[PDB]
Design an enzyme around this catalytic site. Structure first.
Site, short mmCIF file in Angstrom:
data_model
loop_
_atom_site.label_atom_id
_atom_site.label_comp_id
_atom_site.label_asym_id
_atom_site.label_seq_id
_atom_site.Cartn_x
_atom_site.Cartn_y
_atom_site.Cartn_z
N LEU A 18 0.78 -1.30 -0.10
CA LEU A 18 0.03 0.05 -0.05
C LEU A 18 0.90 1.21 0.08
CD1 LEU A 18 -2.28 1.90 0.29
CD2 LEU A 18 -2.48 1.26 2.69
N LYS A 81 -12.48 10.13 16.50
CA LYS A 81 -12.56 9.92 17.99
C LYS A 81 -11.58 10.92 18.55
CE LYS A 81 -11.88 5.58 18.34
NZ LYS A 81 -11.58 4.17 19.01
N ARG A 116 -7.82 -0.32 4.54
CA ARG A 116 -9.20 -0.84 5.07
C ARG A 116 -9.20 -0.26 6.28
NH1 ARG A 116 -8.75 -6.99 4.67
NH2 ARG A 116 -6.36 -6.40 4.59
N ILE A 117 -10.24 0.55 6.42
CA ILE A 117 -10.68 1.42 7.86
C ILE A 117 -12.03 0.68 8.07
CG2 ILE A 117 -9.44 3.33 7.22
CD1 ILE A 117 -11.69 4.56 6.27
N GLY A 118 -12.10 0.51 9.62
CA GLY A 118 -13.29 0.12 9.99
C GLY A 118 -12.93 -0.96 11.04
N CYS A 119 -12.28 -0.97 11.91
CA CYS A 119 -11.93 -2.00 12.75
C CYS A 119 -13.29 -2.39 13.70
CB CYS A 119 -10.70 -1.76 13.97
SG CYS A 119 -11.28 -0.32 14.94
N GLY A 120 -13.29 -3.77 14.28
CA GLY A 120 -14.37 -4.20 15.05
C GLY A 120 -15.56 -4.57 14.19
N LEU A 121 -16.37 -5.72 14.64
CA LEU A 121 -17.51 -6.20 13.83
C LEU A 121 -18.62 -5.30 14.08
CD1 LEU A 121 -17.83 -9.32 15.91
CD2 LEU A 121 -15.65 -8.19 15.52
N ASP A 122 -18.79 -4.89 15.39
CA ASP A 122 -19.77 -4.38 15.79
C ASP A 122 -19.59 -2.67 15.78
OD1 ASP A 122 -19.52 -6.94 17.51
OD2 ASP A 122 -21.89 -6.34 17.61
N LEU A 149 -4.16 -6.25 1.69
CA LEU A 149 -3.15 -7.38 1.90
C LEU A 149 -3.07 -8.31 2.94
CD1 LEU A 149 -0.58 -6.87 3.84
CD2 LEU A 149 -0.41 -4.53 2.42
#
Length: 149
Positions: A18, A81, A116-122, A149
Protein backbone atom coordinates in the site's frame (compact mmCIF):
# COMPACT_ATOMS: atom_id res chain seq x y z
CA UNK A 1 -19.53 -9.70 -23.83
CA UNK A 2 -20.16 -6.51 -21.86
CA UNK A 3 -17.78 -4.56 -19.63
CA UNK A 4 -19.40 -4.17 -16.22
CA UNK A 5 -19.50 -0.38 -15.95
CA UNK A 6 -21.92 1.25 -13.51
CA UNK A 7 -22.15 4.75 -12.05
CA UNK A 8 -20.42 5.63 -8.81
CA UNK A 9 -18.50 2.76 -7.23
CA UNK A 10 -15.39 4.76 -8.11
CA UNK A 11 -13.70 2.73 -5.38
CA UNK A 12 -11.22 0.17 -6.70
CA UNK A 13 -9.65 -2.71 -4.77
CA UNK A 14 -6.01 -3.69 -5.31
CA UNK A 15 -3.89 -6.57 -4.03
CA UNK A 16 -0.39 -5.90 -2.73
CA UNK A 17 1.66 -3.32 -0.84
CA UNK A 18 0.00 0.00 0.00
CA UNK A 19 3.02 2.24 0.53
CA UNK A 20 5.45 0.60 -1.89
CA UNK A 21 2.80 0.30 -4.61
CA UNK A 22 2.02 4.01 -5.15
CA UNK A 23 4.78 6.31 -6.39
CA UNK A 24 2.95 9.64 -6.16
CA UNK A 25 -0.38 8.76 -4.54
CA UNK A 26 -0.68 10.02 -0.96
CA UNK A 27 -1.85 8.14 2.14
CA UNK A 28 -5.11 8.65 4.03
CA UNK A 29 -6.49 6.98 7.16
CA UNK A 30 -8.41 7.58 10.39
CA UNK A 31 -6.75 8.19 13.76
CA UNK A 32 -7.37 9.58 17.24
CA UNK A 33 -6.91 13.14 18.52
CA UNK A 34 -4.27 11.82 20.92
CA UNK A 35 -2.36 10.36 17.98
CA UNK A 36 -2.74 7.03 19.78
CA UNK A 37 -1.38 5.23 16.71
CA UNK A 38 -0.96 1.84 18.35
CA UNK A 39 -3.60 -0.45 16.87
CA UNK A 40 -4.27 -2.00 13.47
CA UNK A 41 -2.66 -0.52 10.37
CA UNK A 42 -2.41 2.85 12.12
CA UNK A 43 0.71 1.34 13.68
CA UNK A 44 2.67 1.01 10.44
CA UNK A 45 2.01 4.67 9.65
CA UNK A 46 3.52 5.71 12.98
CA UNK A 47 6.57 3.74 11.85
CA UNK A 48 6.69 5.07 8.28
CA UNK A 49 6.69 8.74 9.28
CA UNK A 50 5.91 8.58 12.99
CA UNK A 51 5.26 12.30 13.13
CA UNK A 52 2.99 12.37 16.17
CA UNK A 53 4.75 15.47 17.49
CA UNK A 54 4.27 17.12 14.10
CA UNK A 55 0.59 16.17 13.84
CA UNK A 56 -0.31 17.17 17.40
CA UNK A 57 1.21 20.58 16.65
CA UNK A 58 -1.76 20.99 14.30
CA UNK A 59 -4.21 20.82 17.21
CA UNK A 60 -6.78 19.12 14.98
CA UNK A 61 -10.09 17.62 16.13
CA UNK A 62 -13.13 15.65 14.98
CA UNK A 63 -14.34 16.75 11.56
CA UNK A 64 -10.89 18.12 10.76
CA UNK A 65 -8.01 16.59 8.80
CA UNK A 66 -4.26 16.94 9.34
CA UNK A 67 -1.66 17.28 6.58
CA UNK A 68 2.02 16.33 6.50
CA UNK A 69 4.53 16.81 3.68
CA UNK A 70 7.00 13.93 3.94
CA UNK A 71 8.77 14.13 0.58
CA UNK A 72 6.49 14.78 -2.39
CA UNK A 73 3.01 13.96 -1.09
CA UNK A 74 0.47 15.25 1.43
CA UNK A 75 -0.56 12.71 4.06
CA UNK A 76 -4.09 13.18 5.39
CA UNK A 77 -5.23 12.19 8.88
CA UNK A 78 -8.98 11.81 9.35
CA UNK A 79 -9.98 12.44 12.97
CA UNK A 80 -13.22 10.93 14.25
CA UNK A 81 -12.57 9.97 17.87
CA UNK A 82 -10.62 11.73 20.63
CA UNK A 83 -9.32 8.71 22.53
CA UNK A 84 -9.50 4.91 22.47
CA UNK A 85 -12.11 5.16 25.23
CA UNK A 86 -14.34 6.98 22.74
CA UNK A 87 -15.66 4.80 19.92
CA UNK A 88 -15.73 6.11 16.32
CA UNK A 89 -18.98 7.47 14.89
CA UNK A 90 -20.24 7.51 11.30
CA UNK A 91 -21.36 11.13 11.64
CA UNK A 92 -17.83 12.35 12.33
CA UNK A 93 -16.32 10.03 9.72
CA UNK A 94 -18.36 11.53 6.89
CA UNK A 95 -17.29 15.05 7.86
CA UNK A 96 -13.64 14.00 8.11
CA UNK A 97 -13.86 12.85 4.49
CA UNK A 98 -15.34 16.19 3.44
CA UNK A 99 -12.48 18.03 5.15
CA UNK A 100 -9.85 15.78 3.58
CA UNK A 101 -11.05 16.03 -0.02
CA UNK A 102 -11.44 19.80 0.35
CA UNK A 103 -7.64 19.83 0.34
CA UNK A 104 -7.11 17.70 -2.77
CA UNK A 105 -9.09 20.23 -4.82
CA UNK A 106 -7.61 23.26 -3.05
CA UNK A 107 -4.17 22.20 -4.28
CA UNK A 108 -4.66 19.60 -6.99
CA UNK A 109 -4.47 16.01 -5.75
CA UNK A 110 -6.31 13.75 -8.19
CA UNK A 111 -4.84 10.59 -6.65
CA UNK A 112 -5.30 9.05 -3.20
CA UNK A 113 -4.80 5.66 -1.57
CA UNK A 114 -6.10 4.37 1.77
CA UNK A 115 -6.13 0.90 3.38
CA UNK A 116 -9.10 -0.89 4.94
CA UNK A 117 -10.70 1.27 7.63
CA UNK A 118 -13.32 0.07 10.09
CA UNK A 119 -11.95 -2.13 12.87
CA UNK A 120 -14.36 -4.20 14.94
CA UNK A 121 -17.42 -6.13 13.80
CA UNK A 122 -19.96 -4.19 15.87
CA UNK A 123 -18.09 -0.89 16.08
CA UNK A 124 -18.24 -0.07 12.36
CA UNK A 125 -18.79 -1.77 9.01
CA UNK A 126 -16.82 -1.15 5.81
CA UNK A 127 -20.09 -1.52 3.90
CA UNK A 128 -21.18 1.76 5.49
CA UNK A 129 -17.88 3.64 5.21
CA UNK A 130 -17.23 2.65 1.59
CA UNK A 131 -20.63 4.23 0.95
CA UNK A 132 -19.77 7.51 2.68
CA UNK A 133 -16.78 7.86 0.35
CA UNK A 134 -19.20 7.64 -2.58
CA UNK A 135 -21.64 10.30 -1.38
CA UNK A 136 -18.79 12.54 -0.23
CA UNK A 137 -16.80 12.17 -3.45
CA UNK A 138 -20.01 11.75 -5.46
CA UNK A 139 -19.31 15.23 -6.81
CA UNK A 140 -15.53 15.38 -7.14
CA UNK A 141 -12.64 14.71 -9.52
CA UNK A 142 -10.40 12.67 -7.23
CA UNK A 143 -9.55 8.99 -7.70
CA UNK A 144 -9.24 6.72 -4.66
CA UNK A 145 -7.94 3.17 -4.26
CA UNK A 146 -8.32 0.62 -1.47
CA UNK A 147 -5.40 -1.78 -1.04
CA UNK A 148 -6.02 -5.12 0.65
CA UNK A 149 -3.08 -7.29 1.71
Amino acid sequence: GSSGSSGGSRITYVKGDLFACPKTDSLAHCISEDCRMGAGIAVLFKKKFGGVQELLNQQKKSGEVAVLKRDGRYIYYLITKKRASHKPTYENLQKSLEAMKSHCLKNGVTDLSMPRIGCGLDRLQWENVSAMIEEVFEATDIKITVYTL
